[PDB]
Nucleic acid binder design. Structure first.
Ligand SMILES: [K+]
Ligand SMILES: [Mg+2]
Ligand SMILES: [Mg+2]
Ligand SMILES: [Mg+2]
Ligand SMILES: [Mg+2]
Length: 186
RNA sequence: UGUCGAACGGCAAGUGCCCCGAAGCCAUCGCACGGUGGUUCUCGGCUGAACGCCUCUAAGCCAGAAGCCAAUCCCAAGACCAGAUGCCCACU
């Protein structure tokens, strides 16, 4: 086993990172985020004066060490989402039947997917803001905005998986809703 | 067809036989009724290391089968219910 494995993260000036019992709270200009990491058993340390975040594993084999960079990646995603946000833009791709998408508040209704009469409905959680781009700018573009990368990507994924083609060749029939661009709000 | 003499009333033929026949029972031969949520598999994904890349997976998470569990339905305290309650008595 290795005595000491260490990962360090730098923190931007605006961000505030606090750890207490493997629970990380990240505060930026556009909100706050929380992460429950009590399943990890790592030594999380924040240096406020030097604005560094450190995660340490003591006496670890390969499996515990693999969690260090996972923790650093989660905290970095929280910092980025609390200072810039996440914006996932999905596109409706169809051959013949135009996929009709309605965004009334937090509810997404998908109609006419491959000409079907069934209505696919998604209730986006309140931490993710879903909008629909004007068709004159980009046709069939739905945008997800949020501070949490995991929540935004999960919403885009559940929208993608509501429109899977069943009982047809998948190489053909490329109809679906696919995330195209993953960028930041600011 | 016998038989009480006839008529009436019947009776006998282990319900004489034939027609119709209420009540009751009864026929998918008639009529009524037969629900709702979860945990997950296979699988597809998200975030994400290991392995500066990548990766559904290693930690975490999402969606999810006529399966499985509970709701509903049936029996139900030897499941010994210090659950509630009405009277009488005992103790007070
Ligand atoms: K999976
Ligand atoms: Mg075919
Ligand atoms: Mg007779
Ligand atoms: Mg019957
Ligand atoms: Mg990935």
């Amino acid at each position: 086993v290795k005595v000491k494995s260490l990962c360090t993260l730098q923190i931007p000036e605006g961000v505030t990172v606090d750890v207490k019992g493997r629970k990380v709270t990240v505060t930026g200009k556009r909100g706050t985020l929380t992460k429950d990491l009590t399943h990890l058993q790592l030594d999380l340390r924040v240096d406020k004066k030097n604005r560094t975040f450190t995660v340490i594993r003591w006496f670890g084999s390969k499996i515990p060490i693999a969690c260090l960079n996972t923790t650093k990646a989660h905290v970095q995603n929280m910092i980025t989402g609390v200072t810039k946000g996440y914006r996932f833009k999905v596109r409706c791709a169809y051959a013949h039947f135009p996929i009709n998408v309605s965004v009334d508040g937090q509810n997404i209704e998908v109609r006419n997917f491959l000409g079907e009469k069934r209505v696919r409905r998604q209730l986006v959680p309140n931490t993710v803001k879903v909008s629909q781009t004007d068709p004159s700018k980009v046709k069939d573009e739905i945008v997800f905005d949020g501070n949490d990368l995991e929540q935004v990507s999960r919403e885009a994924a559940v929208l993608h998986q509501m429109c899977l083609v069943k009982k047809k060749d998948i190489r053909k029939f490329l109809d679906g809703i696919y995330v195209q661009t993953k960028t930041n709000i600011e």
